[PDB]
C-alpha cells in the first residue's frame, strides 16, 4: 500500500489497519495477515549464520536453536524491529499415510485427518475445593512421544480391539517446505538470521549493542556451535566516519598553514580554526531539530 | 576572536606577480571583459557536450551478488545452484 | 571483474550490485522505464493482447 | 526409533542420521540422492 510521499509511516500503518480488520475473517482456513515490520528496505543491519563442524548438531537443530534462543535474544534489543530467520530447516512431524494400509483397514484419508486433529489438545475442567484449598483440574492430551502419534485411535471394534495410526501409516520426522535457502562459503548450507533496525533509529548503536550481546552467548551456546558473522554495517560506518574525521583534521592544518604563512604572527591561526567546530556545532544542533538522519551524504557538505 | 586574539595571544614579490597584470587588464577595459565573458560562453558550450551519465554510485566494502535465471526452478536445483556459485565465488 | 568471469553458469545471467543500494531497489515498487503503460482490465486474456 | 536392517550395509559403517538433506516438499529423493555423487 503506497502513500503520498511525506506522510507519517505509523499513520499509514494505523490507517491500513482498519481495512485489514474486516478482511481477516474473509481469509481462508488458517492463513494470517502479517503486517510489515517497523523498518524499511535498509534496516538489514547485521546478518550471521549458525554452524557446527563437530557434527553434534544439524540443520534441524541449528534453526530451532535460532528460533527459540537467538531470535529471542536479539528482538529484545532497543530499536530492533525484527529478527528474521534465513535459510533454515524446520522440524516437521510428517505422518506418511500408506494408501494400501487404508484399503486394508477400512480407513479413509478423510477419517485419519479428523481423527488426528482431535487428539492433540489439553483440557481444563474448572477447579475443585478440598481442604479449603483450590485444586485445578488439568487434563493431558498434547502430543509428546512419537508413540502418542502411533497411538491415535481410528477405529474400535465392539470387541475391544482398536486400530491405531501406526496401522495405516508410518510417522517419520523430516524437514518442512522452504521458500529460500542459505549457504555459507560453499562448504556447507546453514541457517542464520538478519537483524532489522527500527527505520528511524541509530544504526551503529544497535549494531554494537547486538555484537556485545553475542559475546555473551559465546559461553551459552551448545558445544560445537559457533556464530560466524556474515555482514557487519559498523565496518563501513566506522570507515566513512574515520574518513571525514581525517579530512576535517586536514583543513584544520591547511588553514593553520595558510593563515600562518602570510601572517607571520602564528597565534592568529589557532583562533581562525575555532570557526570550524562552531560552524559545524551550530549545524548538528539545528540538524537535531528536524531529527533527520546523519548519513554519508549529510556528511558530504 | 580575530582582533581579540591576534593582539592577545616573499610577501613583496608575490603581490608583485599580480600587480603589473592589472596594468595589463586595465588596457582596453571594456573589450577585455567582453572576451572573458565570451571565453565563458565559448568554453562552456563544447565543455557540456562531453560525457553525461546517470547520477550517483556508493561503493561499500563488501559487495552483493545477484544472479537471475529463468522462472520455475526447484528448491532443490535452486539450492544446488546456490552452492555451485558460492564455491566459485 | 575476476568474479564475473569466474562465477558463472548456463542460464544464470550474472549481476553485481551494492547491498544497501540493492535492498532499496528491491522493496521499491515501481517502474524503471522513463515511459510506462498500464493496460488494466477484467480478464488477463484480453489485456495481455493489448 | 531403530530399524533392523536385512542387508545393504555391514556393521561399523558410519551413516548420517537425517532425511534433512532433501526438501520434504517434493525434492525427488532419487534425484536429490544423485546430486551427492559424481
Amino acid at each position: 500500500v503506497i502513500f503520498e510521499d511525506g506522510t507519517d509511516p505509523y499513520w499509514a500503518r494505523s490507517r491500513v489497519l482498519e481495512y485489514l480488520n474486516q478482511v481477516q475473517g474473509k481469509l481462508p482456513a488458517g492463513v494470517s495477515a502479517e503486517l510489515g515490520p517497523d523498518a524499511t528496505g535498509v534496516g538489514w543491519i547485521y546478518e550471521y549464520a549458525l554452524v557446527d563442524r563437530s557434527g553434534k548438531h544439524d540443520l534441524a537443530d541449528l534453526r530451532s536453536l535460532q528460533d527459540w534462543f537467538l531470535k529471542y535474544e536479539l528482538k529484545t534489543i532497543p530499536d530492533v524491529a525484527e529478527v528474521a530467520s534465513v535459510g533454515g530447516v524446520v522440524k516437521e512431524y510428517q505422518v506418511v499415510i500408506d494408501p494400501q494400509r487404508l484399503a486394508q483397514y477400512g480407513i479413509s484419508l478423510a477419517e485419519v485427518k479428523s481423527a488426528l486433529d482431535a487428539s492433540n489438545q489439553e483440557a481444563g475442567g474448572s477447579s475443585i475445593e478440598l481442604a479449603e484449598a483450590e485444586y485445578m483440574v488439568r487434563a493431558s492430551g498434547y502430543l509428546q512421544t512419537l508413540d502418542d502419534f502411533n497411538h491415535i485411535v481410528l477405529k474400535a471394534s465392539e470387541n475391544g480391539v482398536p486400530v491405531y495410526l501406526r496401522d495405516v501409516a508410518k510417522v517419520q520426522i523430516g524437514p518442512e517446505m522452504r521458500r529460500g535457502i542459505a549457504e555459507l562459503n560453499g562448504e556447507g548450507e546453514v541457517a542464520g538470521g538478519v537483524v532489522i533496525l527500527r527505520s528511524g533509529k541509530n544504526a551503529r548503536e544497535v549494531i554494537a549493542a547486538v555484537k556485545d550481546k553475542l559475546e555473551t552467548l559465546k559461553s551459552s551456546l551448545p558445544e560445537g556451535v559457533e556464530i560466524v558473522t556474515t555482514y557487519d554495517r559498523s565496518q563501513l560506518i566506522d570507515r566513512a566516519i574515520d574518513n571525514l574525521s581525517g579530512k576535517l583534521l586536514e583543513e584544520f592544518i591547511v588553514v593553520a598553514v595558510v593563515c600562518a604563512l602570510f601572517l607571520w604572527h602564528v597565534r592568529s591561526a589557532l583562533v581562525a580554526i575555532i570557526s570550524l567546530p562552531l560552524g559545524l556545532c551550530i549545524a548538528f544542533i539545528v540538524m537535531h531539530f528536524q531529527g533527520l538522519n546523519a548519513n554519508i551524504m549529510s556528511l558530504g557538505g | 576572536v580575530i582582533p581579540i586574539l591576534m593582539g592577545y595571544w616573499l610577501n613583496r614579490f608575490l603581490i608583485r606577480v599580480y600587480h603589473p597584470l592589472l596594468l595589463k587588464v586595465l588596457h582596453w577595459p571594456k573589450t577585455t571583459l567582453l572576451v572573458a565573458a565570451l571565453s565563458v560562453l565559448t568554453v562552456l558550450w563544447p565543455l557540456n557536450k562531453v560525457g553525461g551519465e546517470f547520477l550517483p554510485q556508493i561503493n561499500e566494502g563488501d559487495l552483493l551478488y545477484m544472479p537471475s535465471t529463468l522462472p520455475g526452478i526447484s528448491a532443490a536445483e535452486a539450492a544446488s545452484m546456490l552452492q555451485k556459485t558460492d564455491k566459485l565465488i | 571483474e575476476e568474479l564475473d568471469n569466474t562465477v558463472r553458469l548456463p542460464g544464470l545471467a550474472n549481476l553485481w550490485v551494492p547491498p544497501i543500494r540493492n535492498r532499496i531497489d528491491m522493496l521499491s515498487t515501481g517502474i524503471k522505464s522513463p515511459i510506462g503503460i498500464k493496460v488494466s482490465g477484467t480478464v488477463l486474456a484480453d489485456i495481455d493482447a493489448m | 526409533g531403530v530399524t533392523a536392517l536385512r542387508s545393504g550395509l555391514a556393521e561399523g559403517e558410519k551413516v548420517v542420521s537425517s532425511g534433512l538433506f532433501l526438501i520434504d516438499s517434493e525434492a525427488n529423493i532419487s534425484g536429490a540422492l544423485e546430486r551427492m555423487r559424481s
Binding site: 554452524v51 563442524r53 540443520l59 546453514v190 | - | - | 537425517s18 538433506f21 546430486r35
Partner: peptide, 26 residues
C-alpha cells in the same frame, strides 16, 4: 576466460549428525 575448477557434488561440513551401524536386538 576463467578455467577455474569447482566441485559439482553437494557438500556439507557445517552440520551433519552421523551415527554408527551396530549389531544388536530390537
Amino acid at each position: 576466460a576463467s578455467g577455474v575448477r569447482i566441485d559439482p557434488t553437494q557438500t556439507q561440513n557445517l552440520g551433519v549428525k552421523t551415527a554408527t551401524v551396530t549389531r544388536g536386538p530390537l
